[PDB]
Amino acid sequence: SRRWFHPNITGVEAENLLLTRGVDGSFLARPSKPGDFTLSVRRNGAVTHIKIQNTGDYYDLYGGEKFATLAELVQYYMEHHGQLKDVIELKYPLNCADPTSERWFHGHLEAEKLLTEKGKHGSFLVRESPGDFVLSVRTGSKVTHVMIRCQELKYDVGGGERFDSLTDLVEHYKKNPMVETLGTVLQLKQPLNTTRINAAEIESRVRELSKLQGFWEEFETLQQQECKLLYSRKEGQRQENKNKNRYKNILPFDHTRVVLHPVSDYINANIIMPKSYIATQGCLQNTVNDFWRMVFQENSRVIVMTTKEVERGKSKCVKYWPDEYALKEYGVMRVRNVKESAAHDYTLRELKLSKVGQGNTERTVWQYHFRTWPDHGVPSDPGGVLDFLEEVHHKQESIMDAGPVVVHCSAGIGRTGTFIVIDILIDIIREKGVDCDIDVPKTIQMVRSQRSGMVQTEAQYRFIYMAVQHYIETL
Ligand SMILES: O=C(O)c1ccc(O)c(-c2nnc3n(Cc4ccccc4Cl)c(=O)c4ccccc4n23)c1
């Protein structure tokens, strides 16, 4: 669960919540009053606020480490005591009762129209009735409305138990379905889908999401679902693999990691299946050889670099390619940089990859280096990114039996997830045309189960909508 995250509270509300309802070791996370986060912890009768920064690459904790998600951050510190500091301990989550980041909560709602149009057997939603709530379910086919009485800070369906939150009530009736007199089981199988749009109606959705914003609420609801993606990252934790990670706590899921054929099988990279991708971190001096072994083994012919080598005076990715016209050996792999072409937003490098001692293994690898992405945030216009993805897509499509496209930035989750998701969404619109259904958070949740924290910020999330809108507008 992710109940420790409170989306609509202030620092004072957090302090009073922790002092009156928590104990020593009580904690909560919250958005900054913007784009930053606060971890508030009770220690020796007093509340300590710790800043968490995300500019689009990773969650950066003051006095701690860098993480792919807030859930991974909390999971780590709740398991590894002494790592946060005077040591600060995360013992007890202080649960949030606010239903705003729940998939099924639709405040003011109409609900019968949505359930009849979009719904199926077990599709449900919760809405605001005075101060009371309504649970509306579809079964088959028909729609049933259950009143939810709010009586003295507690919620109930007219009898039995009284829950401290709508979430507790929903979860209880999810596991224990209400049975109507004549036998209809009020199965709450899945929340009603309200995010799937028809591609031709994107400008309408972007307009509604821009109203007081809706983009923030939709993104935080997606963030609440990240607690279901805490898959094992054991291989990245091995002693022999620690120095192969750019960030010690940003690791690849074992079940999707690229396996390389003493301990020569590891790279911090994952296969992303929607044309497949490999999402990876920027090379380290000690991982350049593992990087070319991955490119060669996977039969990849296109590499997308979405970062400069150095940003804000800090190394983001080492130069893993030779200078123009030069030849270099990276272990068993040989790379020639044949030609470099400069365009406004990017540089194209035509590389020739082969295994040393075997000439017939040679293939051209096209490296598309996007150089104009800002240090913080996202571009103000998606046209540059869209023209770039269009060219990358056409190169990939022209090469018979080409392997997955290699995509990397620094940690390989923010800008990498953003470029991949845009590329997945636009591909549906290429194959199926303007008359197709696209579901942005569904696409992201799917990519995120293949690599942690793919798409880092709300600014990137909004950029994905703007990019899809722009692609459809130029169709
Ligand atoms: O063994 C399994 O089947 C299994 C299943 C689900 C999982 O989430 C994991 C697991 N994978 N990584 C982690 N980390 C991260 C970590 C540990 C050490 C060094 C760096 C990093 Cl960044 C956790 O802190 C963690 C904490 C509690 C419970 C599982 C955890 N876990 C393993």
Ligand SMILES: CC1(N)CCN(c2cnc(-c3cccc(Cl)c3Cl)c(N)n2)CC1
């Ligand atoms: C007002 C509200 N609380 C905010 C927006 N909203 C929703 C609903 N569903 C998703 C969704 C869709 C597909 C996959 C995933 Cl994981 C998610 Cl979470 C979403 N992001 N927002 C509706 C309720």
